């Protein structure tokens, strides 16, 4: 098939340009939002990222302050544990 | 995260997530070029409220964080989040404009989850792969009605093709042996991982491949959660 | 000794897709190609018979 | 629970699309009745002019004390407007545009009425 | 919380404008003991009406309710006691209909085939 | 009951399609109505500007205690809005747009009102 | 007076005509055990239905209410007790649905995918 | 007797299909003392939503009424107490909204931007 | 101390612009991505390879 040579020549020009961007550009990591809330009020939030360059991922740091108000009994961590702090992304 | 939170105590938790767009650091496939004028770039996030993070004893601890006899009075005091964006600045500009990996930014790299039901003991349960995606990994969580077991409720797991042909029909201990040479440990009990990074499941150039779980014991309201990871383009 | 339709031994290559071959087409598609349909059957039978 | 089909059904054709002319209503009152049936024969207007159908209807029973029926002939549709209401009603009318109106009020009630020929959705405020 | 459903159907429907015209079908019925079947498959094959899209049910004199059921879908639209109405309907290329009532009565019904938005003449 | 036809009906033309300009609306207010009839003459806006007709109307009687009428001139349609409701009402208005409003409240009620120029279906929540 | 807001959620929807067909899905719901999750992501990926745009909810014999929730949006369409109805929904490429009720019941539910205007059979 | 008005305003609107997508915005409102202002001018300039055309107002658990007011046109759509509903609104390119209620409470609100017709779940 | 005495660690360029500016727990998270553990208490690593 003659159409499998152009789609391999388009991969060769693409991989030539990938190693130009990764070698001749600057990796930046900057904070876009931070917010502290109470989950009784709201728990779904929207984050507007920065519109610059070639975005290649997000690092999300979630903290919590769980308090047990029971009289005598305790709770224990589940198997998934703190990975259930973000319900959906 | 602390292992237990006693009556009257307060536990401090922290947790990090990497939401990927590009496939890796050296492979810019799935990356996003966000230098567009009227950009609609967006990152939604939902968090655990006081109804989904504390399960009672005998409940389903799947989306929960803590579970015990005192979960009826557990509550959050705060949740704080911080988002950091990793990107590449100072792109090479030429005479005709930007120099970019064009069919690397045209490709998406996606992560989806689902939930299937209808499991019967000693009957194969097939979940079909979508024909438009090139699947890279598969994660199956056998949630056996609020109970998780370390392989003692599954006969086998497989990746069956369209005719009837199986490609990896393994015992749950031998299935875990294949993931131990990838992530060097075991996933938690009930979680099963299938790696296809050396040869992705395209299921458009070789038939209709499905994912099979043959269970041994099925409780009431037992479901099978299926996480996917795949490439997507317009070829 | 070369043949213009010989794809290899016919009991080993009859159900084999070609090299690139993401999705295969059908060999014919009144409603579509007709003499291209008839020559796609003659070329296949010449592969199974060796000139 | 037994099932029983039926013998024969009817099949007419309608005017559910847009006019080659503009939207045009026809104000049909001076029908002060209380005891009779009132025929509207719009076949006069359908061929002398380009009034190529009746699609919707507007009935105004704001001071009428009883209901108000209008019947289409070749279709057999039997739209009845309520007592003190008013509103728009889509219709199933063929090219032979004929209508028969009725009444149940407390004397002749002078009900204003409009034959629309274009599409307006239901609402019976 | 949030247990998962096992099996659901997937059916094709009628939603466009026919190659003919707006064509309804008067199908006055009488239940009088249990049920009435309406089969319009003969009209679909023999060049007539191309698929029911809307119902017009006219029960202003009937003292009970009238139910119309599609067998290929399972939708069971139930018109109320002394009301007239237009009802959009989920019907297939197989136009079978199970009509029911309580005891008696005769109801004018129009199988309409073109989209009309919903409405019901009295409310409350 | 015997079938009796009638003598004569009228036929005006309307504005049921989309504007060549944009969707527009006209607000009519400060309606301190001690005098009952109030004229709205939108013929000033139709020829000077591009306000090429009134198709729908929005009446807000949320604080009104009585009903509220609006009358079209060439058509004779006399849409009445209920007491404590608000909603949208399609209209039959010709190219020479004049309106007459009236009232049955308990003093002047100020009645915010909009002349809508495009198509909005009925709903009187 | 004049208290500005901080966070809103922008999200894309399904509002056009499918280039497949008008395709609805019967997914009869069993409650009096939990809340019910419906996931149609498998149908969207495997070539079937493109996106739920309208709901048909049939509550004729039920004594309570029925709530259907979209998780990407937060829309909480709640059908009432003895009524049937068509309801347009704001739903995304994720076709996940949280179905709930008050006590019991079996509900015929149709995930319609084409626009049908709203209507409810009895009102009040 | 036969009086004529003096002054009336003219406003240009949003009434067509966006060349983006069907896009609604969840903007859950808590008032709890007086009033709440919503300003969507930032989204309109920064490439997001083109203009609000419909509201979805969800008042099931709220025991009073809810008023939403457009400032450019003066339209003041008022939702009833225990009802949900879709409401077309007359809004300008300046997409400001003044939401009000009686006393308390939180209710979901969606700013829809594409035309949906009316509808209110219980009536009367 | 384990990051409790530092507000943020960063790296600036000529026009005073931070090309990374992280929390001490986020600075240590990028360390765990490379050496699969934490450096000892008070040690902060920055990879630029």
Numbering used by the authors:
A (entry chain H): 11 to 99
B (entry chain H): 150 to 384
C (entry chain N): 30 to 58, 96 to 117
D (entry chain R), F (entry chain S): 2 to 126
E (entry chain O), G (entry chain P), H (entry chain Q): 1 to 124
I (entry chain G): 298 to 346
The authors write:
Bacteriophage PR772 is a ﻿double-stranded DNA (dsDNA) virus with a 70 nm diameter icosahedral protein capsid encapsulating the internal lipid bilayer along with numerous proteins and a 15 kbp long linear genome. In previous studies on PRD1, it was shown that the capsid is formed by proteins P3 (major capsid protein), P30 (capsid associated protein) and the vertex complex. The vertex complex includes the penton protein (P31), the host-recognition protein (P5) and the receptor-binding protein (P2) along with the infectivity protein (P16) that acts as a cementing protein, holding the vertex complex together and also stabilizing the pseudo-icosahedral capsid of the virus.
The P3 monomers (subunits a, b and c) are interlocked to form a trimer that appears as a hexon. Our studies show that unlike what was predicted for PRD1, the penton base of PR772 is an asymmetric heteropentamer consisting of three copies of P5 and two copies of P31.
